Coordinates of C-alpha atoms and ligand atoms in Angstrom, one line a residue:
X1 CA 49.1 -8.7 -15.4
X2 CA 49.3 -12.6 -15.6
X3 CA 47.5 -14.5 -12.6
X4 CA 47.2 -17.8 -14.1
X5 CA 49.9 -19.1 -12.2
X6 CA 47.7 -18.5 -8.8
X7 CA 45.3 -21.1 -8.1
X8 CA 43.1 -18.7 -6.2
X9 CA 43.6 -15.7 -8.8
X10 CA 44.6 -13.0 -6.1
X11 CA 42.5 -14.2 -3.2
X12 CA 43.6 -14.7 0.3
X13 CA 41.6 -17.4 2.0
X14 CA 40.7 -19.5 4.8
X15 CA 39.1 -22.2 3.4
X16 CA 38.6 -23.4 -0.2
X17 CA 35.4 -25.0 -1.7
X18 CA 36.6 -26.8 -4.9
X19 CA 33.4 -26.5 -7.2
X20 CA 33.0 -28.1 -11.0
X21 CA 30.1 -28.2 -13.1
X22 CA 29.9 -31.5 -12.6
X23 CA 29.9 -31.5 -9.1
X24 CA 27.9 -33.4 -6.8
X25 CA 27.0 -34.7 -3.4
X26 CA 29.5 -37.7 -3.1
X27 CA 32.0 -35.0 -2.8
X28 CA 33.3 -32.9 -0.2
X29 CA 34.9 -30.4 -2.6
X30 CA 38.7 -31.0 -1.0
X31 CA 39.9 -30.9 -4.4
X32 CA 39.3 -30.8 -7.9
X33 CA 39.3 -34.1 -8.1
X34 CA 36.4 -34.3 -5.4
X35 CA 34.7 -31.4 -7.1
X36 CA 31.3 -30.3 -5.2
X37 CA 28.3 -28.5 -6.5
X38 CA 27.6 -25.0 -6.4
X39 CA 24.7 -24.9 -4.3
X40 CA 26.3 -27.4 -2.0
X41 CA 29.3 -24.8 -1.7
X42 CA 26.6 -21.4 -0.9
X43 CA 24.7 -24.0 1.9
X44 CA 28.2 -24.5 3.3
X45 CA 30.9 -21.4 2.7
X46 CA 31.0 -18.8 5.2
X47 CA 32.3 -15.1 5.5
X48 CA 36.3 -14.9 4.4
X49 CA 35.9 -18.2 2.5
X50 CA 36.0 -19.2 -0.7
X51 CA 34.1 -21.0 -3.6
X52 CA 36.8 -21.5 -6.2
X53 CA 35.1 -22.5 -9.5
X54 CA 37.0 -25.0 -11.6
X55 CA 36.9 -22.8 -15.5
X56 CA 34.0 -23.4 -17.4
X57 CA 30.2 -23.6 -18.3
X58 CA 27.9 -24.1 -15.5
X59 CA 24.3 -24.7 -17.1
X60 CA 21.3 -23.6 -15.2
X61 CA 18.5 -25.8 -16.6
X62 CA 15.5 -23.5 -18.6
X63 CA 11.8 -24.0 -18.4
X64 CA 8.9 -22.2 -19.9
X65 CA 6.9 -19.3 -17.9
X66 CA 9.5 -20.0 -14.9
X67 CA 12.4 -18.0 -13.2
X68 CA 15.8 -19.9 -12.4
X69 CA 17.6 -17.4 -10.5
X70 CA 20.2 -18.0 -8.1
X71 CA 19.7 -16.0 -4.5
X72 CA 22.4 -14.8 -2.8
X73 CA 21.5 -13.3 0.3
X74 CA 24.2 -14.6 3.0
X75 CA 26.1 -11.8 4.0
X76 CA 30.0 -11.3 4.4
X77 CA 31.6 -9.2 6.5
X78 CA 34.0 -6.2 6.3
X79 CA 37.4 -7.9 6.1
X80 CA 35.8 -11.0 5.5
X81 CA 33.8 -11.1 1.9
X82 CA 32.2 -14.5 0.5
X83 CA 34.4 -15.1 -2.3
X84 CA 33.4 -16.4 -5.6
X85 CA 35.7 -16.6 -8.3
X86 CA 37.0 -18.8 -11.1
X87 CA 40.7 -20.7 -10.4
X88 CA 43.9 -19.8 -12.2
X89 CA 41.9 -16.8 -13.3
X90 CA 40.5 -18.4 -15.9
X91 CA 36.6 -17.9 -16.9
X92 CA 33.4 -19.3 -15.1
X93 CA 30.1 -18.9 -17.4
X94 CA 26.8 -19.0 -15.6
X95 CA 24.2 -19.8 -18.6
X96 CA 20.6 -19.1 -17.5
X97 CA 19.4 -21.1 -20.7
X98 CA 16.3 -18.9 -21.8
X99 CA 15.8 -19.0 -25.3
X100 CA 16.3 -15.6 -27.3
X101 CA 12.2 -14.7 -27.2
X102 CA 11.4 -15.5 -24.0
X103 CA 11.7 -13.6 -21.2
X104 CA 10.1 -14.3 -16.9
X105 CA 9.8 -11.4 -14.8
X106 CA 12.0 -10.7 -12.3
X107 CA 14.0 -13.6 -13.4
X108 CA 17.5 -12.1 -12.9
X109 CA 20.6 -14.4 -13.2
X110 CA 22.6 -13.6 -10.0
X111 CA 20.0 -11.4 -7.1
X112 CA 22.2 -10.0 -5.0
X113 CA 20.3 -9.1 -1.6
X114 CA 22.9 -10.0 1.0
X115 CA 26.1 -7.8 1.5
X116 CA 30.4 -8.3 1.3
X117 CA 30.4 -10.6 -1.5
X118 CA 33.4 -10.3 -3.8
X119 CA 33.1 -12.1 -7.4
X120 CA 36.0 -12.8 -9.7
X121 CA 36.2 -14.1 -13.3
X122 CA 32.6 -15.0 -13.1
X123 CA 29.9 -14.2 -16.6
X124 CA 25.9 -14.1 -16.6
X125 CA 24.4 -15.3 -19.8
X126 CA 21.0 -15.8 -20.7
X127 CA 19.1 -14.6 -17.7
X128 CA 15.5 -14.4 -18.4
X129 CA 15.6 -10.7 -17.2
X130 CA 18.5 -8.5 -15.9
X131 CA 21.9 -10.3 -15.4
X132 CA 22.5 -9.2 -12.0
X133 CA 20.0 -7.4 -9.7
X134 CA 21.9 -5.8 -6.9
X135 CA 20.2 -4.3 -4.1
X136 CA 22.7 -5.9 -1.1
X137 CA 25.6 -3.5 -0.4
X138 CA 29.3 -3.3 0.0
X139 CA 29.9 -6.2 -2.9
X140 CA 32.5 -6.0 -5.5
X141 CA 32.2 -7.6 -8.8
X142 CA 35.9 -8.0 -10.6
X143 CA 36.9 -9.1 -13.8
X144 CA 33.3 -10.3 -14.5
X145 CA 30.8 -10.2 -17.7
X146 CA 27.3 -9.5 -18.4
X147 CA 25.8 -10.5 -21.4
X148 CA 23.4 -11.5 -23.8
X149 CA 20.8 -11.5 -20.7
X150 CA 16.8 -10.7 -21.7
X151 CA 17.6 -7.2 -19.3
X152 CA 20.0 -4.7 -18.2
X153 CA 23.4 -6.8 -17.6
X154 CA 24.3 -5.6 -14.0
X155 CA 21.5 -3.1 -12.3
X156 CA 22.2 -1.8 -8.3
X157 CA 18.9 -0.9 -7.6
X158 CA 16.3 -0.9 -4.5
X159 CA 18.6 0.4 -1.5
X160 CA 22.1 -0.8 -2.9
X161 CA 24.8 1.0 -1.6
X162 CA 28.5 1.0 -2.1
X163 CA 29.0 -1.7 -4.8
X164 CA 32.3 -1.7 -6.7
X165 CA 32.1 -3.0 -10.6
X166 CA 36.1 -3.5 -11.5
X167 CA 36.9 -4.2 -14.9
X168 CA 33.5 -5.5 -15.7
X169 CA 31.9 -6.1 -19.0
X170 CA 28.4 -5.7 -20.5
X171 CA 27.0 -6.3 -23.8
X172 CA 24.6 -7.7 -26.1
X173 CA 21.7 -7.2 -23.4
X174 CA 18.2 -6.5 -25.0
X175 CA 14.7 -7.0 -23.5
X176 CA 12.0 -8.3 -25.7
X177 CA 9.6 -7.2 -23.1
X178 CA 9.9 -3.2 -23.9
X179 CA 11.8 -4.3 -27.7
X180 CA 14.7 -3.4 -26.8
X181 CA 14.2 -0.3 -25.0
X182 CA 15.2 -1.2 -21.5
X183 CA 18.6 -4.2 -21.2
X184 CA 21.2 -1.3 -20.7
X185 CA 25.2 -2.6 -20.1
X186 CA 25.3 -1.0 -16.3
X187 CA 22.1 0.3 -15.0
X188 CA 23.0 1.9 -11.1
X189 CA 19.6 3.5 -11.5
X190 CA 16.0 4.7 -9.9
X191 CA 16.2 3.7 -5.9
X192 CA 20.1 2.6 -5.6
X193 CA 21.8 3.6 -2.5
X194 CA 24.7 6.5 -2.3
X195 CA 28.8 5.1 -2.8
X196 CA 28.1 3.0 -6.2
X197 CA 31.3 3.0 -8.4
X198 CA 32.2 1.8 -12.0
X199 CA 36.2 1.3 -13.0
X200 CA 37.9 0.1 -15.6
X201 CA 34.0 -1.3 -17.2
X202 CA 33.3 -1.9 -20.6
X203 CA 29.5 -1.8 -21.8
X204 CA 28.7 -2.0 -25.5
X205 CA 25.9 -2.9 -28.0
X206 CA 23.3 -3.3 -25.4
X207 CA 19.9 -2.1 -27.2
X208 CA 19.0 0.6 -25.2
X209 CA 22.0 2.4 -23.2
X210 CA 25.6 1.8 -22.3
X211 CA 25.3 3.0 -18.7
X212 CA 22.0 4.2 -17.2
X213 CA 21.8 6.7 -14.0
X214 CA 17.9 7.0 -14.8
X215 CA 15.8 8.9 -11.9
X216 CA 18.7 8.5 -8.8
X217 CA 19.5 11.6 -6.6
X218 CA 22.5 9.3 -5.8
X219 CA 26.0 10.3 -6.7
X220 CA 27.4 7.7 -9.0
X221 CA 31.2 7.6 -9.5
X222 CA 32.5 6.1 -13.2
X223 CA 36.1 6.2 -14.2
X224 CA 38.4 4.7 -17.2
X225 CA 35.3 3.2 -19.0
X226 CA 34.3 2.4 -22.2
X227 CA 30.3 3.0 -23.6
X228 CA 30.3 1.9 -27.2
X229 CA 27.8 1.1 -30.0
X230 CA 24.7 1.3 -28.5
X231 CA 21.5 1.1 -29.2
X232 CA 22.2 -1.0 -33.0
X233 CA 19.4 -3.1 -33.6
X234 CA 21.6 -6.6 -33.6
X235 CA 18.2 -8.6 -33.4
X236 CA 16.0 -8.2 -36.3
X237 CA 13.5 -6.7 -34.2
X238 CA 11.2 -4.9 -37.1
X239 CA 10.1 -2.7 -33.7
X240 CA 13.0 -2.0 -32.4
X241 CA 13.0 1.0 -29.6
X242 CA 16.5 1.2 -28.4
X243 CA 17.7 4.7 -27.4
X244 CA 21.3 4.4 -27.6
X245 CA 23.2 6.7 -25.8
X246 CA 26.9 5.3 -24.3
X247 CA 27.0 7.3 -20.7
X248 CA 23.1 8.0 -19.7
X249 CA 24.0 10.5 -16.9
X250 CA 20.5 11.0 -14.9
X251 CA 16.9 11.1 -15.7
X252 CA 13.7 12.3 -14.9
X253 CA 14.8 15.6 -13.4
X254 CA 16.6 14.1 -10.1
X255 CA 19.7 16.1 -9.1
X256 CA 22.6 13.6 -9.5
X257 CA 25.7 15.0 -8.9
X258 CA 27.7 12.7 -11.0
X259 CA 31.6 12.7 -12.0
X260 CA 32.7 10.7 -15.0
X261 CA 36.5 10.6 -15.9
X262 CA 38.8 9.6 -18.2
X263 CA 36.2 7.8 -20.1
X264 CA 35.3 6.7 -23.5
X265 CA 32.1 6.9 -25.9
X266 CA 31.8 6.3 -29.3
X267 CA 29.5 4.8 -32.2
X268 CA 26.4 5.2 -30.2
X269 CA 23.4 6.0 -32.2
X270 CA 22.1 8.9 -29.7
X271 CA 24.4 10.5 -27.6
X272 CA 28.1 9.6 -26.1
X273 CA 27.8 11.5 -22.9
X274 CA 24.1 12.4 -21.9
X275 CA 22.6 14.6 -19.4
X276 CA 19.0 12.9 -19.7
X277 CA 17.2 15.8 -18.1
X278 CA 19.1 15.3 -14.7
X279 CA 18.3 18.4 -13.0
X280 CA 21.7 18.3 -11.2
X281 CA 25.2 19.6 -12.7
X282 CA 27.3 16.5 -13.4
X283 CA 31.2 16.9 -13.6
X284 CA 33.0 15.7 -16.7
X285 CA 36.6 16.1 -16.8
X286 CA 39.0 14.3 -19.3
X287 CA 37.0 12.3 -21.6
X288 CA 37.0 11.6 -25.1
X289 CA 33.7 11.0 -27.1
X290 CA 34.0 10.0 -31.4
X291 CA 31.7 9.6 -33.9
X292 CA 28.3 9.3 -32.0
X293 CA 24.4 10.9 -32.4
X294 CA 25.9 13.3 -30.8
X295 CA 29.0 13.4 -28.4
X296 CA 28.4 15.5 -25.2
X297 CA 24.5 16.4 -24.8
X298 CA 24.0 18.5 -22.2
X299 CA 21.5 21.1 -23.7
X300 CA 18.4 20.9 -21.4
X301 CA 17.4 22.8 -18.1
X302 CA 19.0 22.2 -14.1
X303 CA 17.7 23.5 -11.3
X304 CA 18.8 26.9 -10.0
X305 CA 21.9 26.9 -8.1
X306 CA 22.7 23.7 -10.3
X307 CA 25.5 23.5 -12.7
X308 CA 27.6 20.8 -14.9
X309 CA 31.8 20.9 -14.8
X310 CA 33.5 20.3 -17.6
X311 CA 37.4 20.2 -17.9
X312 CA 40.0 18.7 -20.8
X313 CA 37.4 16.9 -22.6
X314 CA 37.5 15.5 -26.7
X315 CA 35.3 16.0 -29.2
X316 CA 35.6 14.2 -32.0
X317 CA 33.4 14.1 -35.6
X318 CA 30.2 14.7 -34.1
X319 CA 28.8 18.0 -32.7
X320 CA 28.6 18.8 -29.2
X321 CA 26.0 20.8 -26.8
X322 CA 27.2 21.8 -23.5
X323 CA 24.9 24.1 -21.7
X324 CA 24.6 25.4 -17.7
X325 CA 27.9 24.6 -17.3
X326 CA 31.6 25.8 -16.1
X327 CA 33.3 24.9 -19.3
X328 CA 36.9 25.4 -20.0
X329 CA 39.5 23.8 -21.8
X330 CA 38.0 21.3 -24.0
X331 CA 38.9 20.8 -27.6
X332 CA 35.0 23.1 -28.3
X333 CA 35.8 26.0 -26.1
X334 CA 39.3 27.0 -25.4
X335 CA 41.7 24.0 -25.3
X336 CA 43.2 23.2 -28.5
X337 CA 41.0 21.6 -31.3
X338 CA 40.9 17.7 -31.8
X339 CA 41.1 16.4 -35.2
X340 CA 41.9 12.8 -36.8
X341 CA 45.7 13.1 -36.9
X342 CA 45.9 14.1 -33.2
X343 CA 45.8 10.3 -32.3
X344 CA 47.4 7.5 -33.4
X345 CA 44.6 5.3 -33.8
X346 CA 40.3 5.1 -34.8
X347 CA 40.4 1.7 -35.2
X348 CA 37.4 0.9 -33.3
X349 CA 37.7 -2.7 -33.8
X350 CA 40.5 -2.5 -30.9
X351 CA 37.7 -1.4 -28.1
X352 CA 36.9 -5.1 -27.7
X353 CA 40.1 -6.7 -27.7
X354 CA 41.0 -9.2 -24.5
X355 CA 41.6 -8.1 -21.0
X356 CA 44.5 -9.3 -18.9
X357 CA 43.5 -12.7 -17.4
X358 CA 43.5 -10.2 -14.2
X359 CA 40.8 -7.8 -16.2
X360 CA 43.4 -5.3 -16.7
X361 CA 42.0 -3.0 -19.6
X362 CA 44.4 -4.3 -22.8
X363 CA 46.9 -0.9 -23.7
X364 CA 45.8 -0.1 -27.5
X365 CA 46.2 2.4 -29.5
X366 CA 43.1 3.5 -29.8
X367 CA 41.7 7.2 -29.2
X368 CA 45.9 7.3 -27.7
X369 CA 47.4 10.9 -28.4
X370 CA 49.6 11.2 -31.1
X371 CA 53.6 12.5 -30.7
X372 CA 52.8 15.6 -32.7
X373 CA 49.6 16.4 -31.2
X374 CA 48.8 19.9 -29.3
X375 CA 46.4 18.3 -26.7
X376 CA 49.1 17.3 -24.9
X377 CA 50.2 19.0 -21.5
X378 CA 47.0 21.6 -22.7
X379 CA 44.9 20.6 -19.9
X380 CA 44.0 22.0 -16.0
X381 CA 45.4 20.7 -13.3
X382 CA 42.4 19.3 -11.9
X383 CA 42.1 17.8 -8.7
X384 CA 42.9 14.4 -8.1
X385 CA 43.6 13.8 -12.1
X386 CA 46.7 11.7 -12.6
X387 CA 49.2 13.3 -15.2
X388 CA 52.8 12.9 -16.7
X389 CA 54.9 16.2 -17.8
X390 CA 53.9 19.2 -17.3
X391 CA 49.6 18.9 -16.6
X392 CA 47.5 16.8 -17.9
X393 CA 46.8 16.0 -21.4
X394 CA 43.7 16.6 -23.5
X395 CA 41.3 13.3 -23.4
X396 CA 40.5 10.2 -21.5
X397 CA 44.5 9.1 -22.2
X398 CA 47.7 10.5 -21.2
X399 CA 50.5 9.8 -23.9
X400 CA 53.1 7.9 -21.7
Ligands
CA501 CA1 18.3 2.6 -20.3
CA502 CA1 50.8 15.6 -19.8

């Protein structure tokens, strides 16, 4: 929907800190006329306020061999998050100014330690290492971007535990450090705590993956997203190591009892869906993958009394490689096939096109079933799977 009508895009608060980029201390931030600055805001705002950012670019200054990040380790509470988000939902860029080679160490753009923040309309840029480092817990990140950072755009690592990433972009994230192969989109990885969820994320053209699980025994939960054209060397790097797979689903054999559904890869140079040697079976139900490396790989070992659920999945111009698994009903086994004419659109160039104001998803045709097509009502009624007529459809989209 349309919030630009509300001044505080959604949020009910007690108190309001008006914030600008040129904000300063002969303000009190009453107003954006009286605009104060952001770190003047975080000294003073307190759990269940808010610091409403006027829309714009807010410039954190860049110097050689030094980080710039911005700690945020006050805590909220439950019922009562720290708000930060952008007025009239509009946009507010942070730019971490680090040119395109250089890169410091632990130099994240937002490090997240504290817990209950809630973020709105807000965009890390040019971090000198990942975008945002999350290792607080119970923070939500809505409508935000992460991109074109010298790391992984958004990583919950470290002890981070039920984080929610709403409608939440990231691309164009590549490490010079590793050339390329480390800056993933979404990286809830390694040491993260249980409860992280992705919904309604987009994450494309990051040099290594879209989304990375990598070495987490931690169930991570990842529904109506997008993991697209990764791993394309956009940087003229003549040593370019990017792996490019869209959904990394696990890594060095932990069990990670993941569920992805109703989600979207294509164009990635490796593999759409991946099982990355995670011992653990993952559960896959109602997703379409096009045109990748390889669209579902799932063809190395789990550990006994491990295996992978798959239900009404696509697969689309690529092969696919689904191993130690309960399969049924995708277009490979025995739901109906999936071929060009079953949807209405392969126009890729309409994966990108602008959210809602809100961060709604925008309603394409894209990968959308056509009227004619068998994959509709030819799915299980899985559990918990949302569906019009008579069951649910074949693919990451119902035809409504
Ligand atoms: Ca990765
Ligand atoms: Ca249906």
């Amino acid at each position: 929907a349309d919030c630009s009508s509300d001044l505080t895009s959604g949020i009910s608060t007690k108190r309001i800190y008006y914030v600008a980029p040129n904000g300063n201390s002969s303000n009190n931030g009453s107003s954006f006329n009286a605009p104060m600055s952001f770190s003047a805001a975080m000294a003073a705002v307190n759990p269940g306020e808010l610091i409403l950012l006027k829309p714009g670019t807010y410039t954190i200054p860049y110097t050689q061999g030094k980080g710039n990040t911005i700690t945020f380790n006050k805590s909220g509470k439950d019922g009562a998050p720290i708000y930060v988000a952008a007025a009239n939902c509009g946009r507010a860029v942070f730019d971490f100014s680090f040119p395109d080679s250089q890169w410091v160490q632990a130099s994240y753009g937002f490090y997240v330690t504290g817990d209950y923040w809630y973020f709105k309309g807000v965009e890390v840029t040019r971090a000198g290492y990942q975008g945002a480092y999350v290792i607080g817990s119970h923070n939500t990140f809505e409508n935000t971007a992460f991109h074109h950072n010298r790391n992984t755009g958004l990583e919950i690592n470290n002890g981070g535990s039920y984080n929610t990433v709403i409608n939440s972009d990231a691309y164009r994230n590549y490490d010079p450090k590793k050339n390329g192969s480390m800056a993933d989109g979404f990286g809830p990885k390694q040491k993260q705590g249980p409860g992280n969820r992705f919904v309604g994320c987009r994450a494309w053209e990051n040099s290594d993956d879209g989304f990375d699980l990598f070495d987490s025994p931690q169930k991570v939960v990842i529904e109506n997203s997008w993991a697209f054209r990764n791993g394309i060397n956009y940087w003229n790097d003549s040593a370019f190591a990017g792996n490019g797979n869209g959904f990394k689903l696990g890594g060095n054999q932990a069990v990670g009892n993941h569920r992805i559904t109703r989600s979207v890869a294509f164009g990635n140079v490796s593999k759409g869906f991946d099982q990355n040697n995670n011992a653990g079976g993952v559960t896959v139900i109602n997703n379409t993958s096009y045109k990748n490396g390889i669209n579902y790989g799932f063809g190395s070992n789990v550990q006994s009394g491990q295996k992978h659920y798959f239900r009404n999945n696509v697969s689309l111009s690529a092969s696919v490689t689904v191993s130690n698994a309960d399969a049924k009903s995708n277009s490979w086994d025995t739901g109906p096939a999936a071929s060009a004419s079953d949807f209405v659109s392969l126009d890729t160039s309409l994966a990108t096109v602008s959210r809602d104001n809100d961060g709604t998803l925008p309603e394409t045709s894209l990968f959308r079933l056509s009227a004619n097509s068998k994959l509709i009502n030819a799915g299980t009624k899985e559990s918990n799977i949302s569906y019009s007529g008579s069951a649910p459809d074949l693919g990451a989209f119902e035809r409504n």
